Write a protein that binds this ligand. Structure first.
Ligand code: HEM
Length: 199
């Protein structure tokens, strides 16, 4: 684990895969209702990181970071299907500091691998202009855009104890994503995909 980015990854791949499994478990693209529940979920998570993509300091460290946010697009997708911007019951996490850097990674990385999701959403007749705006690949190409993003993440070079809090934040970002998922899909507390399942 050299770079800060490859360390965030190393430490969170496990929980990442459990999310991958949990998302696939609830059949997101099986029907329309389900894809709508999938959007509500994406909506809550992205709402929860919107203040972080828009944070003034981080926007100084990462040029145009604020224009990378995808909550805006998710609200547009919900509209697409005659839906009001979903509203979460409780009050959303509003993280800051080192931990917030972990949420950002979690969020920006999901745009990287969103390829798989985008591919299955298009079957359901959804894409960049209708229903799947937030899953569409970045105009500069997922890989390029992500490598560019990783550059600035690594450039932050915070104290090793800071990078630590960020990894702790990325882990909590993932856990939270699952809490939201469980509630949106009517799953019990701590519900996880069938054990042993692999992507
Ligand atoms: C069924 C849904 C999902 C699938 C199939 C999936 C798949 C993938 C794949 C295959 C990659 C590797 C991309 C590459 O290196 O080219 C990736 C990266 C990533 N995904 Fe997911 N993912 C899913 C959901 C999520 C969600 C909902 C989050 C966030 C809450 C998430 C966060 C990330 C992050 C942070 C990365 C970057 C990993 C890195 O450091 O390279 N993923 N995903």
């Amino acid at each position: 684990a050299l770079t800060f980015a490859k360390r965030l990854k190393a430490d969170t791949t496990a929980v990442h895969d459990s999310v991958d499994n949990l998302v696939m478990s609830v059949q997101p693209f099986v029907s329309k209702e389900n894809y709508i529940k999938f959007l509500k979920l994406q909506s809550v998570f992205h709402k929860a990181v919107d203040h972080i993509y828009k944070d003034a300091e981080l926007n100084k460290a990462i040029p145009e970071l604020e224009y990378m946010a995808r909550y805006d697009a998710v609200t547009q997708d919900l509209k697409d299907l005659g839906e009001e911007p979903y509203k979460f019951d409780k009050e959303l996490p509003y993280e800051a500091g080192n931990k917030a850097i972990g949420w950002l990674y979690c969020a920006e990385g999901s745009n990287l691998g969103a390829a798989f999701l985008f591919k299955h959403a298009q079957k359901l007749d959804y894409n960049g202009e209708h229903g799947a705006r937030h899953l569409a690949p970045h105009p500069d190409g997922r890989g390029k855009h992500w490598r560019a993003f990783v550059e600035h993440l690594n450039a932050l070079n915070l104290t090793p104890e800071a990078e630590a809090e960020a990894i702790q934040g990325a882990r909590e970002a993932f856990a939270f994503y699952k809490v939201v998922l469980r509630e949106t899909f009517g799953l019990a507390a701590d519900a996880e995909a069938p054990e042993g399942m692999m992507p």
